Symmetry: D2
Amino acid sequence: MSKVGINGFGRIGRLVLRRLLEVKSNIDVVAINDLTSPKILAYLLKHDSNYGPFPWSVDFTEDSLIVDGKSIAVYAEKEAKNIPWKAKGAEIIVECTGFYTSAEKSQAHLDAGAKKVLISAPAGEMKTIVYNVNDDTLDGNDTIVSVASATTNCLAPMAKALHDSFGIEVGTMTTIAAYTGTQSLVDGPRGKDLRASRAAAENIIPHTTGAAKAIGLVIPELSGKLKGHAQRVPVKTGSVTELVSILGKKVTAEEVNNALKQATTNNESFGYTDEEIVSSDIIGSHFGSVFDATQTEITAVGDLQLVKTVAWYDNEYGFVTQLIRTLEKFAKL
Amino acid sequence: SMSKVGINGFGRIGRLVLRRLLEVKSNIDVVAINDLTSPKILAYLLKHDSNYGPFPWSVDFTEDSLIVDGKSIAVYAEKEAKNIPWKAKGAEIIVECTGFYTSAEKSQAHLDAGAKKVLISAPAGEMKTIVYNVNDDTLDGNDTIVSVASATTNCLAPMAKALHDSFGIEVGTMTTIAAYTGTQSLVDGPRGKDLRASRAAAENIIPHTTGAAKAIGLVIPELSGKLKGHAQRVPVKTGSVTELVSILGKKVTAEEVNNALKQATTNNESFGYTDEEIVSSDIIGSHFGSVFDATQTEITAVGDLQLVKTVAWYDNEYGFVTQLIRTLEKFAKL
Amino acid sequence: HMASMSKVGINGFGRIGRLVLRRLLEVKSNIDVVAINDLTSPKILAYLLKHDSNYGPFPWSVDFTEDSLIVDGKSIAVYAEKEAKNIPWKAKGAEIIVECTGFYTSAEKSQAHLDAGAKKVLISAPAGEMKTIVYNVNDDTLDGNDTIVSVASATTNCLAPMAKALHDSFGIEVGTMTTIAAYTGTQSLVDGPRGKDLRASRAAAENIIPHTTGAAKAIGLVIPELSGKLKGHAQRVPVKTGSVTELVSILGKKVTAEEVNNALKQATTNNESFGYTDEEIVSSDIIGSHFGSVFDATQTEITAVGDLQLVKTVAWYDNEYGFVTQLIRTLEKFAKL
Amino acid sequence: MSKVGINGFGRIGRLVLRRLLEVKSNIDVVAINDLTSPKILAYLLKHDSNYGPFPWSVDFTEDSLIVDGKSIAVYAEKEAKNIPWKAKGAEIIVECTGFYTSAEKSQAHLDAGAKKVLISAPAGEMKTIVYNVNDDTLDGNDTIVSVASATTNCLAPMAKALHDSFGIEVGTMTTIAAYTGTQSLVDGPRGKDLRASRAAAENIIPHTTGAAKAIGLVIPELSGKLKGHAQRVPVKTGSVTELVSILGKKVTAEEVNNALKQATTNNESFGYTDEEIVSSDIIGSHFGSVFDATQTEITAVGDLQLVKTVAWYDNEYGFVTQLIRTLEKFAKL
Ligand SMILES: NC(=O)c1ccc[n+]([C@@H]2O[C@H](COP(=O)([O-])OP(=O)(O)OC[C@H]3O[C@@H](n4cnc5c(N)ncnc54)[C@H](O)[C@@H]3O)[C@@H](O)[C@H]2O)c1
Ligand SMILES: NC(=O)c1ccc[n+]([C@@H]2O[C@H](COP(=O)([O-])OP(=O)(O)OC[C@H]3O[C@@H](n4cnc5c(N)ncnc54)[C@H](O)[C@@H]3O)[C@@H](O)[C@H]2O)c1
Ligand SMILES: NC(=O)c1ccc[n+]([C@@H]2O[C@H](COP(=O)([O-])OP(=O)(O)OC[C@H]3O[C@@H](n4cnc5c(N)ncnc54)[C@H](O)[C@@H]3O)[C@@H](O)[C@H]2O)c1
Ligand SMILES: NC(=O)c1ccc[n+]([C@@H]2O[C@H](COP(=O)([O-])OP(=O)(O)OC[C@H]3O[C@@H](n4cnc5c(N)ncnc54)[C@H](O)[C@@H]3O)[C@@H](O)[C@H]2O)c1
Ligand SMILES: [Cl-]
Ligand SMILES: [Cl-]
Ligand SMILES: [Cl-]
Ligand SMILES: [Cl-]
Ligand SMILES: [Cl-]
Ligand SMILES: [Cl-]
Ligand SMILES: [Cl-]
Ligand SMILES: [Cl-]
Ligand SMILES: [Cl-]
Ligand SMILES: [Cl-]
Ligand SMILES: [Cl-]
């Protein structure tokens, strides 16, 4: 299988390699570009605060990591057009920096000699894939594709199942989510977002997300029908997404749960639980989303009905399992 | 009028009841406390507070009392309310904060033990349940035992009242993203029969059932049975937020919803307004029961369908207590 | 070969009790857990066993009935007796009790399990002056006549291997210890009474909390030559698990940091209980450790003015799982004596 | 001199202003240099996650803050030598960025028109002041001074009291300390320090500190006699320092506690407690250091004795009170 380069060896970038080795993928990771020395990247890869020790050996040289006995080139080019992707033949770039989230920006990797780029974040109006929701839309002509956010990978499977079974007329989502590197440790400036400047592990922090707003890139029939936001909270990873919908049909909780159970069957992207789990129980999940039947709520007065559905997600590893599913298919095309 | 209070349960709420009475220089005096522990320990906890810092007045103790700002408070340690000697120091109104007497029948014990009225710091079934500046006009001179519901109820009710008066609420569901509390667990282990309550609270997002929405009809009778809800408990020590998703009886804009709220909060000592980009730690110490945040208002419309999301902050300890005390000061004078 | 004892009961299916079962299964021990006594329903114990905040999903299947757990297909009886003397351990023939409640920390208290039909008891905590074992430090003192034994605290299992190595190589004349340690269920979630100790009443995930420990004071039970030569305490802090112990010593010899690190390295060679690191690790890196203690050469410090010298040595420990590994090593040996 | 500028309006820089206003200082803060807009600085000054709402009014303009009705110029120069300090006549700079911690570096403020610099951090071999320990060494001719670290301000009054009473012959320190902005929110590169790269609110993290090694600048007789380090842990502010010493005389715990009690009497910088406090009770302290008699420990075998003494410190607000005490004195010489 294809050779891969990772741009941005951060939380997502590191976990991309972790998961590729875990599934014994035929993808060959040949190069990493970041901003730092191999010594520091080796340290971060070996020791992880959320997932514990790297399951394979890790060393470094002047200009590479040696991971499980295999060499991976390390570059330190702030501008992607300068990355020497041709030197080890990286053909598909997993773009994980947060700084090339558009077609025009990620073109820099094609200019630097890669064939294709898979962006680990929403990236505007480009093909945007949630594996096992719309990955059938990928074809052999696609060169730059997005996997949207972790929140999108949580929300889309639930929304798709509800829409297929009952119709969603309108809905709003809140995700109660783990804090991430976009936030701040101590109160201090963090770009232009005032809320992002506040100490993440000491606060409930409202936070804008486009997961609902841009859901039409993944599920066309739902364009413009959803809105939402996030409340970021002090858990290191592991998150939960609530959706409150008006559906096309009156339902019971059992009926909603059964429909979802059915959608999750033989679906390695979308899991089901009727156990009273909590966020730490999703840490390390191999699903993009886990529907939780225990939290389903129907509120009805006369002809009016509100349906609340909830799914968990490991915004780090869980999401990464989706990104890797997508990467495997994209590399085959 | 009545001017002497007894506190049953000198916990998070009990201690803050005393703090707040003193802060507002109430004419109501706490004359007795009933707990399970020694005055030495109660003194220690009153002086040193993890959420609110050092007590602003002097605190000392004897074998059977606290001495707060130089005034003597009796301390009893009776497992069973019916045995608390409330007449000894003349406690007329019991602020019942233990979680163990949340019914008319149960709290009757305080009256059997000599007090005249009981205000329960929690939901307590079908009795008069007051959210100050929503339905406190329902209290009369014949009431002896009343509830001030939960902190979540005090957050939800004012927001729900203002929306309902201006627009009508046809149906709604809430989720409160809430500070963990002493009903939860520090490390994973049994916590009665509730599975989720058994999990380490400072290391998890934990779904948690709450009756705030289900029982809203005690506070706002026209919303009776129209709302549902739950909580997600998260790792902050105090400071919480309630989101309500409603279908209203009129199409609206966010500007219009926020203006209606601004009007309802204006000169309203119980219900505040912000259009600043605040986070939970900025609500710690709030003197409101609920602070509407106009920055989080969202209207989702598709044709004739419309979902309105409104959001209010609450200091589930001190904020709520300010309400409890508003209610207490009025209840003392009927 | 005559059968060694192979059937275990766990009293207190708590943080430690659930990890005992976990580690026994993990290492494919020939010891079988046949019964558990706690104060709750199988339903709740099964939920807590399946879902762990610190170590994640249980790696084997878990189901339950009205009076048992079914774990990896094997039935384990569940009893609910608050008094140990009433536990019906004979029903499934539990021979060795792993006593993990915190309520029977003496020989007088734990011999109730013998009354209740067990043959031996291993206590997951200090339990007075009984035989107290830190594996790979003094487990050679265990013999066939020991009936009730302690493995001391997680802090003792961290401290002892370091103190043993230093004392063997250089001599410890006097020393004091501070452990910076994860919070535990003896502490409080919110500020409120917690028995008689004032500090234990404070919100554990929101404070640094000084905390008394006997690990140094009772070190003579494990290393007799240091009896009465050490004091110390803990500072409990807001991490869920994973802890570190610092020891400051006056030694019998002048040393360099390098000579200390090398002596410790040799003491950790061929030693499944005591590890060594020279990497810049932090506490989350010790979570799930299979050692009782990991000596961290990066934190060694020698302060020397003329003839006077103070030596600081630091070891990490996973107070939950790492300690549990030491308990299980001792249990396996106890069972075969 | 009564006109001050603040370089770096961070945790320390903002609390500098808060404390100045709280004590009604006659110091006039005329200018602030940062990198961010006044809008964002206003928001941060108004809402503090550790200390709650700012007690005075705060507005802004495109180039100023208006605090309690008074205008403060805001500049945005990333090089100190370009800061226009002469425009509003800022004479004393409180240097709070962490990037000018030497004489040669802070010289830039003087080239830029200031007359004195007070550095909020250790700054090498220059005049270094712990107030109520050695502020009587501050000289009319000093133009660049340091107030060392929060940890130095905790350690120094305790060490001085012990040393005057008993003699300290050698000693080592460990501070168990709240995390700060030099650490990381998520695992990721943080300069060259590997430990600084790890998620600060999810770990105990060993951290080097010069508080003991450079004690000689403050207490010259203890020069070269102390070493120490930190363990950084997940509390937002509020810290504790332990010192283990060999003293020149045999002592009891009562005797150590009495000597320290005396040292704290009528001492605005050094407090005493015999209550069973924990770290959150130090937050908002007006002392640089609070000796805790409850943790004193004497370990004795034959004629060998080790003495463990312990002091709390609000590494933010507490240290800042010391910085202000020193600034007030400095401004008047
Ligand atoms: N919860 C999550 O963490 C999560 C989930 C889904 C998607 N994402 C997305 O994945 C992307 C990265 O997220 P993350 O949490 O890993 O961030 P992170 O900060 O942990 O990692 C970013 C990495 O990129 C590096 N970097 C920054 N600029 C660079 C440049 N110009 N060239 C090369 N390297 C550069 C940094 O050194 C860092 O190592 C973002 O687009 C984010 O939205 C994150
Ligand atoms: N913490 C919050 O956010 C919050 C908000 C609103 C309402 N409440 C309600 O107020 C009440 C107390 O809550 P809290 O958080 O203060 O709890 P807490 O656990 O902090 O305090 C309860 C106190 O009562 C004592 N107690 C228990 N049983 C007793 C008895 N039989 N006699 C005397 N004392 C006894 C305990 O020793 C403790 O000091 C509950 O009904 C709760 O639902 C709590
Ligand atoms: N947590 C640690 O870091 C750690 C490390 C080493 C040793 N220990 C020790 O191990 C023991 C337990 O610690 P833990 O953290 O598991 O405590 P825990 O509170 O998690 O577990 C105790 C378990 O015992 C049960 N229990 C309590 N009283 C009982 C009784 N009378 N009969 C039956 N069951 C009862 C509880 O319901 C709970 O399930 C203690 O002695 C503790 O000192 C703890
Ligand atoms: N927080 C503590 O506990 C503490 C205690 C003792 C000493 N200190 C020291 O005080 C100093 C600052 O600490 P802090 O905790 O406030 O850090 P912080 O990161 O909160 O604040 C630094 C501020 O300086 C600004 N800044 C960065 N580079 C700049 C530049 N070149 N020009 C202008 N502004 C710039 C940042 O935007 C930020 O607003 C450091 O030297 C630190 O070691 C901190
Ligand atoms: Cl580029
Ligand atoms: Cl992100
Ligand atoms: Cl939206
Ligand atoms: Cl509660
Ligand atoms: Cl409900
Ligand atoms: Cl017994
Ligand atoms: Cl314990
Ligand atoms: Cl001791
Ligand atoms: Cl410069
Ligand atoms: Cl710092
Ligand atoms: Cl040093």
